[PDB]
Amino acid sequence: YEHATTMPSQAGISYNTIVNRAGYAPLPISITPTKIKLIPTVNLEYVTCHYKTGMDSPAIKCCGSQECTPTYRPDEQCKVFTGVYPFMWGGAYCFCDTENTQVSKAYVMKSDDCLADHAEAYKAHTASVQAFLNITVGEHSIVTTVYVNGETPVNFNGVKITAGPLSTAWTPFDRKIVQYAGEIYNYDFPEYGAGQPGAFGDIQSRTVSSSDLYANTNLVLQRPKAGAIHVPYTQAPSGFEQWKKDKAPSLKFTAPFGCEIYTNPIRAENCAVGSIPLAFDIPDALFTRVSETPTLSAAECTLNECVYSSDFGGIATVKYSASKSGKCAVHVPSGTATLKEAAVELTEQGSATIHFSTANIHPEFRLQICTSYVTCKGDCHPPKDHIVTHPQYH
Amino acid sequence: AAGATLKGKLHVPFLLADGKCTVPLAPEPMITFGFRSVSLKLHPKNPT
C-alpha cells in the first residue's frame, strides 16, 4: 500500500503521520530529519595567494653596455640603467664614471606559504540535497542518509522510502565562490587571465602546485640611488590582502533561509526552506488487522488547556470505552493543530491525554484514534512569554 | 656573474601551518525581551 506526504525541510520538527488502510489498523510513521544537506557540484578554476617579488641580482658592467635577455618568467620586467656608480663595502665598483650599466630584472612568483594560505575559486552548480532521517515505522526505528533525487530509494526492513524532488531550487551558493580559512564567500572572481592589479586574481595558478601562473601587478622598475646596488620596484599590493581586509562577510553569517555553511565537501545545512515529498512502500506484514487492535466505542474529546504558543502548549483529553487494552495512533489531519504523541496507550474504560500545538484561538479539529474520529473543540489563551528558542511545531 | 649562476636550491623553514590558537570569549550579554523585539546590553572588554 503506497503512501505519500509532504514533510517540511526543517530539523528538530518531528513529523508524524499515519497510514490508514481499511481492514488493517493505523500504522504510525515518525520522521525526524536531523541534518539536511545541500552539496553543490564544484569546479576549481584557480588558486590565488600572496606574491613575492623576485629580484634577480643586478648585472653590472663597467665601461660597457648590456642588452636584456628574456627569461620568460611571470611578469618579467627588464630595464637597463646608465650612469651608475655603485658602492660595495670595499669602495666604488669601477672607475668608469659614466658608461656604466646596470641590468635590472624583476618578476613575480607565488609565496612560500601558498600550500596553506590559498584561496580556492569555484564554480558551483547542480546541488544534490541530502538528508539524514530518523524514521520509526511500527517500532522498527532506522537512521538513514537519503537523496532527494526522483528515484534514489532506501530499503530497510522491506520498507522502501523514496524522497523528493524538493519544492525549491534555491542555493545560497552562486555561480562564483571563493574558499578561504574554512569559510565560503560569494565573490565575482574573474576568469583565468582576466585578473587585474589590486584584487583577487592578480596571481592565478590552476592548482596549489602548478607551473604556469598568470601575474599582473603593475610592476614598474625605477632607477637606483647614486651609490647603491638594488632593483627598486613599485607595484600594486596583494589583491589577496585587500580581499581579506575588505572581506564581504561569509555566507555562514549572511545566507538567507537559515543556512549553516561548512567546509571542503561544501554544504549548506539546515536550510529551512521547501517541503520534501516522500513515498513509502510498506510490506503487508507490518499491518495488523483491526479485529486484533482495539476498536473504540463512544469517544468524546474535551480540552483541558490551550495556549497557542510555539511549543505544545495544548492539552486535550479523550474519554472512551474500547474493546481491548493496547496501542493506537492519533493524528490531526488539518493544520489546525499538530500532535506530539504519535501513539497513545489505551486501557478499556480510561481517559487518555494528548498533547498538541496550535495557532488558532477557537479550535475545532478532527482527531483520530484506533479507527474512529472525534471533534475536539475549545477556547485558547495567549502565551505569557513572547520570545522562545525553538521554532514553530505547527 | 656572467655565465650561469643557478647552482642549487635551499628550503625555506618556518612555513605557515595550521593548528589551534586560544582566542578570547566575550562577556555574556544581557538579553531583555519585548514584542517582536530583542534588546541587548553589551559590555565588552576588547573590541568585538
Binding site: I361, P382, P383, K384, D385, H386 | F35, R36
Partner: peptide
Amino acid sequence: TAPGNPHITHYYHRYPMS
C-alpha cells in the same frame, strides 16, 4: 503577546496593516 485581548489594540500589532 500582543497588547490586547480579542475576547481593541489587538490585531493591529499581531497581523498589522489592517
